[PDB]
Design a protein around this ligand. Sequence first.
Ligand code: P2H
Ligand code: P2H
Ligand code: IPE
Ligand code: IPE
Ligand code: MG
Ligand code: MG
Ligand code: MG
Ligand code: MG
Ligand code: MG
Ligand code: MG
Lengths: 362, 362
Amino acid sequence: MASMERFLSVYDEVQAFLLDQLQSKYEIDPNRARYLRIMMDTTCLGGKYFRGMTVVNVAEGFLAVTQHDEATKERILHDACVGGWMIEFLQAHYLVEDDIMDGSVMRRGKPCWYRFPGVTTQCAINDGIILKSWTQIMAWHYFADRPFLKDLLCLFQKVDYATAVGQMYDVTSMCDSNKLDPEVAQPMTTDFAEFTPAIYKRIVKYKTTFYTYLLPLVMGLFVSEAAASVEMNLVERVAHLIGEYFQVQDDVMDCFTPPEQLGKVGTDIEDAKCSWLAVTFLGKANAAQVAEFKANYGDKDPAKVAVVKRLYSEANLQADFAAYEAEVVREVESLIEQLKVKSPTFAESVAVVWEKTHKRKK
Amino acid sequence: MASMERFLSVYDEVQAFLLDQLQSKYEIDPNRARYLRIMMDTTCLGGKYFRGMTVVNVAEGFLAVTQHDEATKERILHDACVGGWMIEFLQAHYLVEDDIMDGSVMRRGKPCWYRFPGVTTQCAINDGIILKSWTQIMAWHYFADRPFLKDLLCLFQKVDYATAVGQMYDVTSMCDSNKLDPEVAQPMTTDFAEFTPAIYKRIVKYKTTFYTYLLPLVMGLFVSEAAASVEMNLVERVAHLIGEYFQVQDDVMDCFTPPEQLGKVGTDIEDAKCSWLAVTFLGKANAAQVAEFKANYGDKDPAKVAVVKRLYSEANLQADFAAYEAEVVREVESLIEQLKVKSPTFAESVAVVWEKTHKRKK
Ligand SMILES: O=P(O)(O)C(O)(C[n+]1cccc(-c2ccccc2)c1)P(=O)(O)O
Ligand SMILES: O=P(O)(O)C(O)(C[n+]1cccc(-c2ccccc2)c1)P(=O)(O)O
Ligand SMILES: C=C(C)CCOP(=O)(O)OP(=O)(O)O
Ligand SMILES: C=C(C)CCOP(=O)(O)OP(=O)(O)O
Ligand SMILES: [Mg+2]
Ligand SMILES: [Mg+2]
Ligand SMILES: [Mg+2]
Ligand SMILES: [Mg+2]
Ligand SMILES: [Mg+2]
Ligand SMILES: [Mg+2]
């Protein structure tokens, strides 16, 4: 709570930097400054700050065991905060744009940015472009003479790219691969042959895990100058594991958590998404269940949607989930043990990240 | 012609690199590779390559007067080509996204990408995100151990940001500033008070000049290691001047060039754009002309649009244009003369850039 207020005081400094630079260098007028301040506030705040706060917890962990001057402590914490906000702004970018592509209605308990009456798709698209440019403006401003600058940019960009590739895997997950063709309007799949665990796994590996887990963790290492002190293949394997589970939870909540609690309203059934629920159901259903799933999936019709939920409850998926969670707890503990060998501190940081995720309710 | 085929052979190498990396590192399947190849071809090719080819002409100019080994010549030309393609891919990004926000129908003689039947806004938004990520993937791949890497990235990013800020100035140019408010649906301006030369100038400075002129020119200097050899304040002043004129031509052509020749269809009148034509007309019109302009501007109605064109032809704007062109020829020559002092070669490169622009018909 106190630490989160400190993370937010760094948001305020960053907002101030960005907005004063708009006035001093980009000829902005007060009203457009205001619009951009409100956009930044609306798209970047109100979340859990899980990605940002991870950078900071990684850095705090190394600080407890590493000798530094006070001044250097303070710089390290401040950089971890800036780094954290780069990742939040990056997420803010993805969500503004994602909400347009998913035809979404609510986000963090409010309308999606593009649905604000004075915004619309026309302004929102470019607003999301601005959120991303801001990540880079921050990096070059606050990290210009840090040793980790080049490594951080290069990583940030590879993570952004994988994420965008992931979003392509996601937005085309309901069409048949052999039919993808810019020239031909795309029909929803009728056989659901590509609703498989491996295909699902590729969607999720790219669209969520790099930017939600790999980036904040390695970012925490960069600003700590601690990345040579870990086994990177382990960091990857653990980001990919927890990241996958994180997205599985997102999928279950889309169907089962009231929006009242969730803060977004779920579109996966209507959007015909290759979600965990749809893949898992099709891996256990009998012939008649499959036939009725195929009869109602991917239509915006309330009673079709309700038939899918019923088939999901009947297949007892909220116990396939428990079985999957159980295999994940196993594998995460095992990876944490393997990380303990070169860095107890980073292993603990990961234990904390796993814990925050496992207990997640939104 | 031969040189342009050589620029295009570097596009093919780049396309091949990017697409093989998708297969070897991002788990892509052949059909999505194909979709991305067609997207890249459709959004990046078919233009004039003016921005890309400028990087290359800048570099060629320095090569004629600078001693190098043959191998070093060849590397320099190849880097200028890669650099050029970074700028084309960047433009490709902006146009895909711009066409969505302007509700545009045609581009480079074909439907806008988002209008392809098998694309739609849903895929196009993210496709445009990919085009931009590719610029960075290229830079880090082909320029990893070049001395100019850091300078180039930093410049590229500041230019991208200014451009995005410019696009915000553009997409809000028809509303009153004091009324911009995310919460309130935005009405078109009724007084046209902000349709002024200074306001127009700010739109254009940001949205076109950085990325169309400043970037390719300084890029040509980076890959040549020649940037200390110029007066950068002059490079800026000349990019901003020719860039402004470039956009003025774009505005006139939107109204007056048949789409048959233009390769896009014009939306400025219907979109209520603060174009050069609308600003210039309002700077010379009598009270009754202003009243009738305000009666018909910014409606998608064919006969309202036709009344604006008629008022434009009656105000003899295609002679305000000639007067403006004449002041621009003056000022460009003067800047070229001033550049002659430290680099005849770069001055000549600019003379060529001015020439290609001045003679432009699309
Ligand atoms: O739409 P998704 O996939 O279920 C959600 O989790 C968005 N998300 C997660 C990861 C990545 C991205 C993403 C990445 C790039 C571009 C757009 C979105 C979106 P949502 O439930 O909050 O809508
Ligand atoms: O729409 P404009 O402004 O008239 C055009 O020239 C696009 N353009 C030029 C410069 C910058 C950008 C731009 C920059 C950032 C984001 C979107 C577009 C667009 P068009 O006539 O080809 O449509
Ligand atoms: C599933 C993913 C990757 C998108 C949502 O991430 P969060 O659920 O962390 O959203 P916010 O906390 O930022 O609101
Ligand atoms: C006016 C601007 C800045 C956008 C169009 O640029 P071009 O007219 O050069 O478009 P292409 O050559 O790339 O088609
Ligand atoms: Mg979504
Ligand atoms: Mg999505
Ligand atoms: Mg979701
Ligand atoms: Mg346009
Ligand atoms: Mg535009
Ligand atoms: Mg135009």
